[PDB]
Ligand SMILES: Nc1nc(-c2ccc(O)cc2)cs1
Ligand SMILES: Nc1nc(-c2ccc(O)cc2)cs1
Ligand SMILES: [Yb+3]
């Protein structure tokens with residue numbers, strides 16, 4: 001069972017389809033309307049069912065044109081409140097009914113961020129976006145909020161007429177709202193069954209530009225041009241992904257560039273990937289995030305984790321595919337560079353969590369744990385590490401990609417656990433079971449800390465990063481004069497980032513070293529978000545007071561948790577900025593994304 005859902009499990013009943021009809025009210029910061037769920041009984045004599053909700057106001061439940069009895073249970077913290085519905089007529093196995101629930105969301109829905117005009121690029125219109133993963137869909141509409149159930153959907157969304165709605169679905173037309181000529185209805189259809197965490201909505205002053213045969217970029221007008229350039233590799237990435245994963249089944253692959261407060265680098269919403277504007281480096285250097293979101297169209301969206309305990313299936317295989325796309329575009333040495341970078345990231349996470357911490361396990365027990373609190377790079381990189389280790393063990397990339405494609409084919413449109421994956425692994429590689437039995441499965445899947453084996457990594461592109469990092473770490477005062485801008489001349493932006501990543505691992509450095517770095521490399525001028533992030537962390541942890549306003553600024557002017565959370569932690573750990581960190585958080589709290597607010601608050605112990 002899914003310990004994160006309070007709804008009837010899939011073994012009792014299954015939602016087949018959602019029809020959503022709602023209106024977006026910016027003045028009230030509410031979504032209001034009806035969720036019509038087509039539900040199929042999996043049991044004989046079914047007389048009631050339970051749905052997940054969180055901070056939803058229920059007006060009525062209608063079945064067969066009549067109002068029916070329902071009750072809301074006690075709130076169970078982050079899980080929300082179970083909604084039990086008494087069915088008018090007992091259902092047979094496989095019998096389907098339609099249950100139409102009239103509801104309204106709370107302004108504090110953890111699924112939604114409502115932005116005032118002053119929080120947008122254009123400063124004229126408000127903006128709304130959703131983020132349902134893992135378990136926030138219940139904060140938008142009543143549903144079986146579990147990835148074990150996959151449904152198709154249709155929607156009509158009424159918005160002020162000067163604004164545009166988009167969803168994780170194929171755009172199916174727009175018309176004036178016949179109930180209100182100040183409004184427009186946008187229509188949507190998602191014909192491929194999906195888990196409900198992939199339901200998504202944005203409403204705002206959006207413009208679009210075409211960047212490939214099946215891709216429009218959407219954003220506020222101010223970001224469209226930069227976005228179209230930054231993500232121009234999208235179609236070639238899709239073509240490579242199709243070669244590795246099989247047919248792209250989703251029709252459209254559009255991109256939405258969100259305002260700065262979007263909490264993740266991206267979110268793989270079907271037909272409409274959501275991305276952070278911190279990707280806009282000016283040189284396409286952060287495009288691996290697009291590769292990653294594209295790869296989710298197979299691993300995650302087609303083959304889905306059955307519960308959140310098995311989230312590594314989603315993330316590990318997606319990083320694996322992502323690195324193959326990047327490897328095809330830029331070479332195998334680059335795939336290895338990124339892979340080795342990912343091992344370093346895993347080192348950080350384990351060091352930070354503690355090597356006995358339950359959240360360093362590949363498969364976790366999320367019973368009574370808020371998945372938002374458990375989220376980290378561990379399922380990404382430990383997942384990737386396992387697959388890359390298996391790749392090397394089992395005969396190399398070409399062979400392991402054969403498994404990958406077969407795995408996607410096998411489990412498409414289904415939800416699976418680590419058991420299912422392991423069973424199919426053993427089935428596909430039955431001719432190599434002897435090899436497979438040398439894998440320490442208990443350690444890999446269920447033990448905390450670093451993996452029992454480190455894969456083999458090509459070092460070619462990483463050597464120069466390590467060389468320069470070590471020069472700085474081993475430098476004494478009388479050596480600082482030897483550094484100059486020519487040191488970076490043969491480094492790509494990826495290599496500069498990794499140089500900073502390597503050096504940050506040994507932080508603090510002496511304040512004199514860090515001042516010299518700025519003097520010769522002018523890292524303060526770099527706008528690449530990844531590089532700037534690591535540089536500012538390096539400065540704060542090395543106790544450079546001058547970096548305080550820059551770190552505070554980066555932490556608050558964007559909201560990607562990858563950056564914001566460690567920036568606030570570093571600022572709180574520096575005695576000179578500690579009070580500033582806490583105060584700044586308290587001042588920005590109200591206008592932050594609700595999940596980010598909560599997590600930063602936890603991090604700051606406030
Ligand atoms: N065997 C060795 N691995 C490394 C290494 C480990 C992690 C990184 O991110 C980068 C390099 C240095 S020497
Ligand atoms: N392998 C691991 N997966 C997780 C995890 C699982 C589900 C989430 O929503 C967030 C994090 C933590 S450690
Ligand atoms: Yb010396």
Ligand SMILES: [Zn+2]
Pocket residue numbers: 292296314315318
């Ligand atoms: Zn992902």
